[PDB]
Amino acid sequence: AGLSFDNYQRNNFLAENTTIVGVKFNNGVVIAADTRSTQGPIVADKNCAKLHRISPKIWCAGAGTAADTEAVTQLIGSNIELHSLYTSREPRVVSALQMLKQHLFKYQGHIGAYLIVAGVDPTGSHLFSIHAHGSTDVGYYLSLGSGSLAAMAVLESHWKQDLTKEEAIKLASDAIQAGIWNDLGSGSNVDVCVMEIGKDAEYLRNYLTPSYKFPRGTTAVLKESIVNI
Amino acid sequence: MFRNNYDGDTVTFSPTGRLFQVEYALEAIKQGSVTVGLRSNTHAVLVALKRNADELSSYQKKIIKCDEHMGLSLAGLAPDARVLSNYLRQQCNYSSLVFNRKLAVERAGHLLCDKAQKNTQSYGGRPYGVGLLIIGYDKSGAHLLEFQPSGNVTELYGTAIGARSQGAKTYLERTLDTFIKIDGNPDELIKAGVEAISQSLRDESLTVDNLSIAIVGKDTPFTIYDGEAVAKYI
Amino acid sequence: RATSPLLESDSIEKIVEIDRHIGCAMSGLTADARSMIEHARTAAVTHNLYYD
Amino acid sequence: SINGGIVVAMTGKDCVAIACDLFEKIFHYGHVFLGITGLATDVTTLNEMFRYKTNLYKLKEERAIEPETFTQLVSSSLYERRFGPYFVGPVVAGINSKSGKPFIAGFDLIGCIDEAKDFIVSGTASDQLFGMCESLYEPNLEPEDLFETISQALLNAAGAVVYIIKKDEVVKRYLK
Amino acid sequence: DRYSFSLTTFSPSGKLGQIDYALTAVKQGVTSLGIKATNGVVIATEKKSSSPLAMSETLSKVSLLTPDIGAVYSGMGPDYRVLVDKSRKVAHTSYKRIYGEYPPTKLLVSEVAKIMQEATQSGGVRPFGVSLLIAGHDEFNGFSLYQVDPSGSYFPWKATAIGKGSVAAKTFLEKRWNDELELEDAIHIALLTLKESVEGEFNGDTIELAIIGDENPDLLGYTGIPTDKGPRFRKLTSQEINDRLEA
Amino acid sequence: GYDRHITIFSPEGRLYQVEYAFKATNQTNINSLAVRGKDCTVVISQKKVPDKLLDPTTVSYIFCISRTIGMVVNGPIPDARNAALRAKAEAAEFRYKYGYDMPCDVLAKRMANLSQIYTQRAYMRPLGVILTFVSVDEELGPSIYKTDPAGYYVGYKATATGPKQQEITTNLENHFESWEKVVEFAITHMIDALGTEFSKNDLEVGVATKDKFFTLSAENIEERLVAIAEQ
Amino acid sequence: YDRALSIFSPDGHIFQVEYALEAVKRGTCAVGVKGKNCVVLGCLKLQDTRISKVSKIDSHVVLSFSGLNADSRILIEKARVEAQSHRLTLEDPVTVEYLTRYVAGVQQRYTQSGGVRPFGVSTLIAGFDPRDDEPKLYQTEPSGIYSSWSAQTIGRNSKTVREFLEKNYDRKEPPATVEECVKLTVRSLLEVIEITVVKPDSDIVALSSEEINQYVTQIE
Amino acid sequence: MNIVPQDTFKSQVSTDQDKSVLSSAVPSLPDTLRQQEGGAVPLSTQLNDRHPLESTLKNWETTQRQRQMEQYRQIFGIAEPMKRTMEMEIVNRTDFNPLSTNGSIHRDILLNKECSIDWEDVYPGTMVGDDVHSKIEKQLGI
Amino acid sequence: TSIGTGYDLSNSVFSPDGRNFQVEYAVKAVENGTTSIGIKCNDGVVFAVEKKLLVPQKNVKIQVVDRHIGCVYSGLIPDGRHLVNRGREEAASFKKLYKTPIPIPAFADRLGQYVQAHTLYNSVRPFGVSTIFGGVDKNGAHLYMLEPSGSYWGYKGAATGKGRQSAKAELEKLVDHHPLSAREAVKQAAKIIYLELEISWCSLSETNGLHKFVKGDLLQEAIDFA
Amino acid sequence: YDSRTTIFSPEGRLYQVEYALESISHAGTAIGIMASDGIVLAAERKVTSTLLEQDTSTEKLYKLNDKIAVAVAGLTADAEILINTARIHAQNYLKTYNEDIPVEILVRRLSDIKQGYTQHGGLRPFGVSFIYAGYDDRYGYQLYTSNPSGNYTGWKAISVGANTSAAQTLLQMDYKDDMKVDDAIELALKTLSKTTDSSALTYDRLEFATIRKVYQKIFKPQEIKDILVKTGI
Amino acid sequence: MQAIADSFSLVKELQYDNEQNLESDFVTGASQFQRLAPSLTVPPIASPQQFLRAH
């Protein structure tokens, strides 16, 4: 059961042959990310949505192995859903943080998911970072990914206590723009999600968005057939 | 009558608290042949009347040896005697291997007590139904323990177990004042034991085949005398 | 003992070799005898192997 | 060698195309088509597995799997072997039977989903074909303009097969 | 001790006794009912309480299994609670975690039926003493309503009722059901049936009612994914139930 | 038949062995009361200690399960102490796993599911105790949840338990700033229902406050009784 | 004392195994006859004939049965698995005695716990050892007893057919020809047709439902 | 009192270590047909270069359970771990089901896994020896 | 009705009155045992019991479970031995863990949990012993009596066995007289037993807070008082 | 003796399995008919009422595979457990050999599963008997049944459930093995119409399927009604 | 139960809890000389074959 190892020795033998930010503010937290995605130097997909939802008011964005961050984020979102149903209570962000870090700890860092978890709950707004080894730290603002240094530079230059919702969205999108401009991995659009302690989370897809066709019959058809299914 | 209802297992008490299933295992000792044990301060002696199933058969080995310091006597169920003897000798060995110390006789007895108690309280097994006499010599001197398969152990100067043990035990009760002083003259303690086991005999007499003896002491490792070696004491 | 004259007396095998100098005759529930004889044979061969 | 090679899928109006340089590397599970590049042993194992899974799906649901659900099935089946993955680059293409939405997706060894709306390439010569598709591709191609675009791009990637998929019919074609 | 004999067995009549006795325990339970409309499903039941000091807001007899699926029961509440927990867990593990979407009602009902059946084979447990009415919507099968019995048998129903009132409720539904009901008509018929089935005080606090309907984006808890679907399960508040009763 | 020895259904559809586990809960004659203030929850139990030799210091049926949760048990003390240790370990495990203090109703739900296990496994007897959990929840405020041997549980505005629980319940229905007033109220209604003018050692009292759960000491029950006798 | 395998009767019987032999006594009749050169085995309108009670376990060894059909099918499957496991681990095909010993061990194994039912089936095992031509015929019983027989019958009419064989067989003038064995088998069955002939070197023939022997024996 | 599973490698190896799958002809070697592992070719010697995580992920839950029992022994005494273990063994030994792969509904409650998913839940993962009878024989030890 | 026919032949069964008759029968087993008393002083506790080839210096009924805590039991010898040894294990493990003598209430709890666990399953039977145990403690001194049900309470005095009723009555009169020094309590325990003798005590003033046997001179003086 | 399935009676008979067999005598009749050019399956929906969704109660006929279907009589819960086990087995076989499972191999596996539950004492027999219709290129069209005892038999036409004796007598009189599928449909409908305890064989009381040509169809109630009126019921 | 309890009741450090160790050191009888297919010790490491090669 679990994640299989069943081709480890086989694949060994055969081998022998982004910017994310969270910004806490006076009544909530903003998380934002760029939407470029890359395979090697190649942009595999523009407009890739990097903001995952753990719960209605608990949202997530991650770096490292994308499939790992997705799988762990959806597992913890399932556990948070089930726990909320069991307790008939809106889930706590500290509960997501706990079970997410205990999961990543179980895999001793072999599941390479690094995450920023932001949310609001009955106890207020929360913003956390999680590392693939299972280490966490709280913050008022955070940045992650290859552009994490440029975004943190912006946050540290412009962040202040008691940002408003609009000022916090502006700051977050400025830090993502600085990533886009200064990091090669980041680019294309800015996604934003805004969680206010009293309010539904406001997701803002693409908050910022900073002929050769050949004539018919060009290609040499060899033969044709009908496939039906 | 009503005993029939509350006697099916070691796990039902009766309306009187009896726990009949343990009582039946204590009665299982009364089906055993008599054996006597006694000790002085310097030496300990066991005496046993062996039996054979038929005149074509050899006599069954009733006394054993945990090590060079302690030994054992059996009465009752042969399978349980086998189990407990193997257990007592695997404890004597493990003790020697790990600590290089002769297992104290009292400790060995307590280990038997513990092992025996378990079967009295779980449903599936059964009580061991066998009594044991343990003798040994250690730093604390000569020891004689009587084990009952209820999981009761008593250190005694002398005792008997088996079908007519009451006779030998009554005889010993009259004479304990004499045998406990028999220090450094073990031959007289052996002869006192053979006298004690000469009571409780019925239609039978002690013979080099049916009688077995063993002794241990300060100057004497555990030795068993049987066959022609017993003729010195008959 | 033979249930019927069609039973092959040459295959009743109430006596078996356990070892070169040890034999055994059965009586009773033959299945249990088979199990005991297989055990005894295994014991004998193991004792030979380990103690020469 | 029959290991590796290249698969590409591409979207038109009310249609999709999927093509490969060819043993076979495009499979279909009802109206959802899966192209797989990589080790031919792993391609075959994935085909057998997804045939098993989609047959059980169709039996339990009395309904053919939709391309989005098949995409999630492929993603989760790849991640199951997170350690010692299949060395494969799968590509799914299809049209949702209810909405008629043309759909394509592609994956990494462990089932990250690209779900790009324009075109998806995998395998050998991926960056060459990325350049070709970016240059040649235009949105909302007609089915025959889409056929020309996909087939010419594939021929310029470096003996090929093309599927043109409508909601109600599929046309299979070959290229030298 | 390696084996435990089967607690459920066939009688010489060919009837599995423990299954009959679980169905009897169901017959003993308080009335619950459900009704398919053309545009929704109703499920309703009595909040019988052992005291007026009990908090009726904690007597959750109707429970969400998925945003599109809900359940109600009659019989042993603890068994229903454990079955709900397991059905939610299996809805996530077996289906949402594989296909990225919630199961259709048919398959979650099949999973619950499988769970309930295996308690009929085990030699360690009795069967569950509950039957469940499971109402839900699926993108393809549409609105559906199933009744699951202690045997783990299930059948799709247009309307049904279980518990003490079951037979009289089923007759009232059979005379009053028709293929053209709107969800407000189904809610009215449900309330009238329960008024006829309930014992003693009939008010919005002695009843609870849930519907499967259109999506409720105001229950989704977030905004800005326009393809994302609000829950279709919705429990009516006792305020709203009382406002129905004033009709 | 077997339905008498094990928790299988009888032909009536009844689990007799669970109903008999309910009757075990009244084998002690103690009865108890729980009430809610605005910001506190109070539980009153009798402490029947007529035996001169018995040390009433030790005789308590109220258990502190967590920092914020207490429970009173009705039923035999060995099973009460078993349930107490179980609930206490479960509250600690919940805190460890989820990072916040277990709510009273989630602990009640857990213990009810355990009781369901005991009502459904053939070889496990039901536990034979009724558990009343009291807390001040950080979301729900003061709350009372009571759990039966059947594994039923529900929240309550107030409860009574034991042989005379109907008399107290009816007195509460007749009825329906600081926790000391609520304790005095509950004691006064216990007196009015049962007809016994309590000694300082005829009672034990537990209080859940916003911050903690605590049991009153005999000198605190004494001063509460004095403050009652002033009126 | 009847209701467990673990319980000896006061007279030393294990009744629960005798009841499995009574279960065998109800199964459809199977007959076996050794010759000098062969062993012969034998035993509604809307039945689909195309889809024999004689089951090959390996090319050289054959198992018939009587009693519960499903139990027999499980034990046949296990015997086949053991035959192929031996043929894999050791190069030689199984001895027929080895196969019947295994089958009897399996039947015994399902007798060694009160939580499992013993197989209510008796088997008739016929064949030839590899590179050998002594015909071997064996019976297994629910107890896991096994015995070698010159001829045997099991099931519903085994009493009368066996009492017939006990006089029409001769231990020192056994049938010395395939047709003579088939004749004796059919005669024994006609006291109450399907016939299988096994021959050395893995040669086995289901005998075509040749009624000629039937007509000849009815003339006799 | 362990966090990461420590004892995670076999100290001794033998051709007979694997019981229930032994050759009846020679009770010293595996039954490679009944193993159905693809021949003898999965020889036991090939249990080498295991993934570093595997030997810890397989038995992570067992280690967590052992730590939990140890903590209960330290704080509550020998009674509490004994009770927990007895309950758990009763559940395990009375749930026999040869057709279902799913975990027992009560086992999850005892483990407090009613509202928990893991990859072993999501991903619960043959010509010989797959039959119901092989499971019966394993469970009864026939 | 004391028998309970039809609800008695298996452990863990509740009768229709909610009684566990196997537990009541294990209590009735205690009523057969050697009459045994314990007395709680101002400063400590004292225990006494009513009780030829036996080695007399080895024939001792009061069991020291730890220097901290003394124990005496009545009922089934092997059950008593087992419970005593389990308690000695629990005490030793507590001491190894927390580097302090086991608080008497914690020890009592652990024993009650161990006995009570034997009431849960049909595969085990209740212990046929009631145990009186106690000792000096960080918080003073405590006397407990642990019934075979696993029910336990603190006591100022307790008696078990065949003479338990008269012992209880006289110990209650004693408590009514002193609403005790270790010396006086020893004398009264000897008297209550007389109403062979063996006594042990534990007090901060007169045994340094250890458990010790009352033997020799003071035993003879107690017999003289009796 | 009947208390548990692992005990032989003194008569050598397994009463618990005979009671599992007798359980099917109370399930509504199912019938199956093999023709020269296909197979007919039909079953009575004995549990019926106007509030039941007949249009979606597929409740006695279940396809296990292409070219294989089963008709169920007895406990539907056990039925669907066995059906899902058989579906998994058929898909494992296809995965391993890349060929459709032979019908007899599937019937054998399911009958071995049903047998095993009669042999371990903590399990009861499945209170269900299947009729299997299928096609394979070894034996072509073939039809089987299996009992709670886990024995099976091949049949040209068979009936299971309450009135199996009557239905089988009517089959034995009217069946002829050169009939066509269109003839077998009408023979099935006649048999059920004369066998049913209902006053009339209303289309909602029927479930119907055929395997022929290779394609299988489970009839929706509209075409069931049309086939009924075409037959004249 | 008691067997379970005794699992929670000095032998851990020298590993004479391990049955196969007790046998190997001939604590639990001569059973090491009573088994066919003699058991062979393997070093408890991630790369036993490397340790063997390093002989």
**Distance (Å, whole) CA K38 – CA K28:** 16
- Which of I110, I153, I177 to mutate to probe the F interface, most F CBs <10 Å? I153
Count interface pairs B-K at CB distance under 8 A.
16
Does the annotation count I34 as an active-site position?
yes
Contact by Cβ (8 Å): B160, B168: yes
**Distance (Å, whole) CA G127 – CA J120:** 32
**Distance (Å, whole) CA G193 – CA G31:** 11
Pick the CATH number of F1-231 from 3.60.20.10, 3.40.1160.10, 3.20.20.70, 3.30.1490.20: 3.60.20.10
Query: Residue type at B157?
Result: Y
Chain D residues contacting J via beta carbons under 8 Å:
48-49, 51-52, 55-56, 59-60, 62
Count interface pairs A-E at CB distance under 8 A.
38
Neighbours of D144 (CB within 10 A): 14
Contact by Cβ (8 Å): B45, B193: yes
**Among K11, D51, B211, CA closest to J95:** D51
Pairing of strands J140-146, J128-136: antiparallel
Using DSSP, state whether E207 is helix, strand or coil. strand
Token duo for residue G124 = 């008739």
**Distance (Å, whole) CA D170 – CA D29:** 13
Residue E184 lies in domain: 1-247
**Distance (Å, whole) CA I198 – CA J159:** 86
Q: What is the DSSP string of A58-111?
A: EEEEEEESHHHHHHHHHHHHHHHHHHHHHHTSPPPHHHHHHHHHHHHHHTTT-S
**Distance (Å, whole) CA B200 – CA A224:** 111
Tell me which residue in G111, G150, G162 faces C8 most closely, judged by beta carbons.
G150
Contact by Cβ (8 Å): E241, E204: yes
Pairing of strands A124-130, A113-121: antiparallel
Cα dist. B209→B31, B227, J128 in Å?
21, 5, 71
Say if J81 is an interface residue toward chain H (CB within 8 Å): yes
**Distance (Å, whole) CA K1 – CA K12:** 22
Sign of CA dihedral G5, G11, G12, G18: negative
- Which of B121, B135, B145 to mutate to probe the I interface, most I CBs <10 Å? B121
Q: What is the DSSP string of J18-72?
A: HHHHHHHTTSPPEEEEEETTEEEEEEE--S--TTB-TTT---SEEEEETTEEEEE
Gap positions in chain A, given as the residue before each gap (C–N > 2.5 A)? 17, 210
Using DSSP, state whether E168 is helix, strand or coil. helix
**Among A148, A171, A175, A155, CA closest to A18:** A148
**Distance (Å, whole) CA J213 – CA C17:** 66
**Distance (Å, whole) CA I82 – CA K13:** 26
**CB contact (8 A) between residue E98 and residue D75:** no
Q: Where are the alpha helices (DSSP H) in chain E?
A: 17-28, 77-90, 97-99, 105-121, 166-176, 183-197, 238-245
Contacting residues for E186 by C-beta, under 8 A, at least 6 apart: E35, E36, E37, E40, E41, E42
Neighbours of J71 (CB within 10 A): 26
Q: Where are the alpha helices (DSSP H) in chain B?
A: 20-27, 78-99, 105-119, 165-179, 186-196
Cα dist. D10→D100, D116, D155, E200 in Å?
16, 10, 15, 67
Query: Residue type at G109?
Result: R
Q: Give the homologous superfamily in CATH for domain J1-233.
A: Aminohydrolase, N-terminal nucleophile (Ntn) domain (3.60.20.10)
Token duo for residue I131 = 């145990």
- Min Cα separation E35/chain D (Å): 24
**CB contact (8 A) between residue A122 and residue F106:** no
**Distance (Å, whole) CA B54 – CA A138:** 88
Contact by Cβ (8 Å): A189, A209: yes
**CB contact (8 A) between residue H123 and residue D80:** yes
**CB contact (8 A) between residue H98 and residue J81:** no
Q: Where are the alpha helices (DSSP H) in chain H?
A: 32-35, 54-57, 60-76, 79-94, 105-110, 119-122, 132-140
Neighbours of I48 (CB within 10 A): 31
CA A159 to chain centre: 21
Most distant CA pair in chain F, distance: 59
Cα dist. K39→C44, H26, K31, K42 in Å?
19, 16, 11, 10
Tell me which residue in J2, J52, J122 faces E6 most closely, judged by beta carbons.
J122
**Distance (Å, whole) CA J145 – CA J129:** 7
Structural domains of chain A, with CATH: 18-229 (3.60.20.10)
Query: Residue type at E155?
Result: F
Using DSSP, state whether A162 is helix, strand or coil. coil
Say if G109 is an interface residue toward chain C (CB within 8 Å): no
**Class of CATH domain I5-226:** alpha beta
Q: Using a CB cutoff of 8 Å and minimum separation of 24, what contacts does J174-180 make? A: J175/G46, J175/J33, J177/J36, J178/J36, J179/J35, J179/J36, J180/J35, J180/J36, J180/J37
Cα dist. I167→F92, H25, I82, I156, I171 in Å?
44, 73, 26, 13, 6
Q: Which resolution in angstroms does this entry have?
A: 2.8
What CATH number does the domain containing B200 carry? 3.60.20.10
Residue of H nearest to A105 (CA): H4
Number of helices (H), then strands (E), in chain J: 6, 10
Which of E48-74 are b and which e, b meaning 16 or more Cβ less than 10 Å from the residue's Cβ? beebebbbbebbbbbbbbbbbbbbbbb
Domain residue extents for chain F: 1-231
Please state the φ and ψ torsions of residue E167, each to the nearest 5 degrees: -70, -45
Cα dist. J209→J61, J62, J75, J154 in Å?
7, 9, 20, 19
**Distance (Å, whole) CA B81 – CA B77:** 6
Residue of A nearest to F95 (CA): A95
Residue H27: how many CA atoms within 13 Å on its side-chain side?
A: 9
Query: Residue type at G146?
Result: Y
Contact by Cβ (8 Å): F132, F120: no
Residue found by looking up tokens 């109430």 in the block: C14
Neighbours of B219 (CB within 10 A): 10
**CB contact (8 A) between residue A95 and residue F99:** yes
DSSP state of A213: P
Q: Could you say which of A18, A19, A69, A73 is catalytic?
A: A18
**Among G143, G95, G150, CA closest to G123:** G143
Contact by Cβ (8 Å): E154, E148: yes
Residue B186 lies in domain: 4-234
Please state the φ and ψ torsions of residue G146, each to the nearest 5 degrees: -145, 150
**CB contact (8 A) between residue J143 and residue G48:** yes
Residue of E nearest to J75 (CA): E153
Say if D73 is an interface residue toward chain E (CB within 8 Å): yes
Q: Using a CB cutoff of 8 Å and minimum separation of 24, what contacts does J215-222 make? A: J216/J63, J216/J66, J216/J67, J216/J69, J218/J58, J218/J61, J218/J63, J218/J69, J220/J55, J221/J54, J221/J55
**Distance (Å, whole) CA B147 – CA E146:** 68
Say if E175 is an interface residue toward chain G (CB within 8 Å): no
Edge-to-edge strand ranges of the sheet holding F153-156: F62-64, F69-74, F130-137, F141-147, F153-156
Total structural domains in chain E? 1
Residue found by looking up tokens 């409309």 in the block: E37
Say if A99 is an interface residue toward chain F (CB within 8 Å): yes
Which H/E stretch holds residue G20? Answer: helix G15-25
**Distance (Å, whole) CA F47 – CA F205:** 10
Residue found by looking up tokens 């939802």 in the block: A53
Sign of CA dihedral I9, I15, I21, I23: positive
Which H/E stretch holds residue G121? Answer: strand G121-127
**CB contact (8 A) between residue H99 and residue J112:** no
**Distance (Å, whole) CA K29 – CA B97:** 12
**Distance (Å, whole) CA B85 – CA B92:** 10
**Distance (Å, whole) CA D25 – CA D90:** 9
Tell me the chain H residues in contact with residue J92 when contact means C-beta distances shorter than 8 Å. 126
Please name the residues between 61 and 100 in chain E that touch chain D, using a CB distance below 8 Å: 97-100
Contacting residues for A2 by C-beta, under 8 A, at least 6 apart: H57, H58, H118, H119, H120, H123, H125
**Distance (Å, whole) CA E218 – CA I93:** 58
Tell me the chain G residues in contact with residue E6 when contact means C-beta distances shorter than 8 Å. none
Question: Do chains H and K have 3 or more beta-carbon pairs under 8 angstroms?
Answer: yes
**Among F130, F88, F137, CA closest to F112:** F130
Most distant CA pair in chain H, distance: 53
**CB contact (8 A) between residue H72 and residue F89:** yes
Number of helices (H), then strands (E), in chain B: 5, 10
Solved using: cryo-EM
Say if G168 is an interface residue toward chain C (CB within 8 Å): no
Neighbours of G176 (CB within 10 A): 10
- SS3 per residue for chain I: CCCCCCCCCCCCCCCCCCCCHHHHHHHHHHCCCCCEEEEECCCEEEEEEECCCECHHHCCCCEEEECCEEEEEEECHHHHHHHHHHHHHHHHHHHHHHCCCCCHHHHHHHHHHHHHHCCCCCCECCCCEEEEEEEEECCEEEEEEECCCCCEEEECEEEECCCHHHHHHHHHHHHHHCCCCHHHHHHHHHHHHHCCEEEEEEECCCCCCCEEEECCHHHHHHHHHC
Residue F178: how many CA atoms within 13 Å on its side-chain side?
A: 2
Q: Considering just the CA atoms, what is the radius of gyration of chain A in Å?
A: 21
Tell me which residue in H73, H74, H82 faces I117 most closely, judged by beta carbons.
H82
- Min Cα separation J91/chain D (Å): 6
Structural domains of chain G, with CATH: 1-220 (3.60.20.10)
First to last CA, chain C: 39
